[model samples]
Target: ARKVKQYKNPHTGEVIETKGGNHKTLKEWKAKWGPEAVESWATLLGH
Candidate 1:
């Protein structure tokens, strides 16, 4: 089973959840905020 990743956008207080990094909204976030910046906003969900 894949682990879920939860990413939050601090600027807009928006949230996105996905099992992998290829998520469409995640890509948009990375492109807009820079991958490193956006990466810091993620919180790994579950074990």
Candidate 2:
């Protein structure tokens, strides 16, 4: 199965498109914003 996930920045309304958690900006977001907040933003596509 193929799927895409999108994480929206709750503070800035920025959308991060990724297939998994390995995205570059996603990593930076996790770095600057913390992994907990980053996980909170994870929204499944087609939901």
Candidate 3:
């Protein structure tokens, strides 16, 4: 399979480009908004 490209943030319109699947962007997001960010997203998505 080919390498995955960066993901752009729909909220901030920022491109989160990463070469690997290590989730560095997630780490940064969690660091910024705590682990509950996932829950927040889930709620936002009405999941």
Best by TM-score: 1
Worst 10 residues of 3 by lDDT: 38-47
- In model 1, residue pairs whose N, Cα or C atoms come closer than 3 Å (at least 3 residues apart or on different chains), thus clashing, are none
For every candidate in turn, the CA RMSD to the true structure comes to 1.7, 2.0, 7.4
RMSD of 2: 2.0
Q: Residue 16: error of model 1 in Å?
A: 0.9
What would the per-residue lDDT of candidate 3 be over residues 1-47, giving only the tens digit for each residue?
A: 33544444456765554434567775676577665653244222122
Candidate 2, 1-47: lDDT as tens digits:
44777888777778878878468879988898998988888877866
User: Would you estimate the TM-scores of all the predictions?
Assistant: 0.81, 0.71, 0.38
Please write out the lDDT profile of model 1 over residues 1-47, one tens digit for every residue: 67887899988889989988478889999999999998888788995
Alpha carbon lDDT of each predicted model: 0.87, 0.81, 0.50
Q: In model 3, what is the error at residue 9, expressed in angstroms?
A: 5.7
Candidate ranking (TM-score, best to worst): 1, 2, 3
- Please identify which of the two predictions, 1 or 2, would achieve the higher lDDT against the true structure: 1
Give candidate 3's TM-score.
0.38
